[PDB]
Amino acid sequence: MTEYKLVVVGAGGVGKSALTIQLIQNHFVDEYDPTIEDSYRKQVVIDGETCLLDILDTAGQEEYSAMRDQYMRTGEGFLCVFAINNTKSFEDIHQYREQIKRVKDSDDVPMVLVGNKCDLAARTVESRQAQDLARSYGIPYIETSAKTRQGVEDAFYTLVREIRQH
Numbered sequence: 001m002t003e004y005k006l007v008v009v010g011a012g013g014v015g016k017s018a019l020t021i022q023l024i025q026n027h028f029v030d031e032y033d034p035t036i037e038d039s040y041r042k043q044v045v046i047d048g049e050t051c052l053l054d055i056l057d058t059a060g061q062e063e064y065s066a067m068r069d070q071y072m073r074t075g076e077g078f079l080c081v082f083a084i085n086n087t088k089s090f091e092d093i094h095q096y097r098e099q100i101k102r103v104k105d106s107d108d109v110p111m112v113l114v115g116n117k118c119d120l121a122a123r124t125v126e127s128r129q130a131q132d133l134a135r136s137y138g139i140p141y142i143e144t145s146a147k148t149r150q151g152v153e154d155a156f157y158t159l160v161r162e163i164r165q166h
């Protein structure tokens with residue numbers, strides 16, 4: 001069966017772990033325990049294909065930015081997450097995409113841009129601003145809430161569908 005190596009990246013506190021745990025374990029993590037580097041694996045059927053998702057949940061705290069080069073080499077597709085109530089986390093996305101491009105030596109790496117925490121009303125990043133950024137990269141933009149599970153499966157499955165176009 002096909003294995004897909006997915007990597008979840010983004011600034012501290014944007015909901016990377018909450019998104020991944022919703023997908024894999026179907027509950028919402030309310031507390032904030034910062035991640036170093038955790039792996040998850042789930043067998044799923046996507047568009048009639050049985051496949052294994054191997055998901056790497058990475059650190060957003062900049063103290064671990066050294067580990068980025070390694071997981072960027074081995075990842076096949078990247079979920080670039082920001083939070084829609086954290087302007088700085090959106091501004092930080094470009095850093096992540098430039099580093100992925102350099103390490104992969106490619107302008108066409110499978111990626112999806114994810115605006116998380118869309119259940120919150122304190123929005124400072126408007127959907128149109130994120131759509132424009134994703135359009136410049138040539139990738140989809142999807143909004144999610146790990147709390148309500150809105151968009152969670154869609155974000156990860158869309159990334160699988162992007163890896164298949166490459």
Ligand SMILES: Nc1nc2c(ncn2[C@@H]2O[C@H](COP(=O)(O)OP(=O)(O)NP(=O)(O)O)[C@@H](O)[C@H]2O)c(=O)[nH]1
Pocket residue numbers: 010011012013014015016017018019029030031032033034035036058059060061116117118119120144145146147148
């Ligand atoms: N309301 C709401 N809260 C969320 C959502 N996603 C995450 N959170 C909350 O935000 C906090 C941080 O979430 P977490 O997944 O740990 O963030 P992270 O990106 O993995 N942090 P790190 O990079 O340090 O590992 C938690 O308190 C969590 O419950 C969401 O979609 N909505």
Ligand SMILES: [Ca+2]
Pocket residue numbers: 027028029030
């Ligand atoms: Ca909980």
Ligand SMILES: [Mg+2]
Pocket residue numbers: 016017018033034035057058059
């Ligand atoms: Mg985390």
Ligand SMILES: [Mg+2]
Pocket residue numbers: 124
């Ligand atoms: Mg504004």
Ligand code: NA
Pocket residue numbers: 068095096099
């Ligand atoms: Na980076």
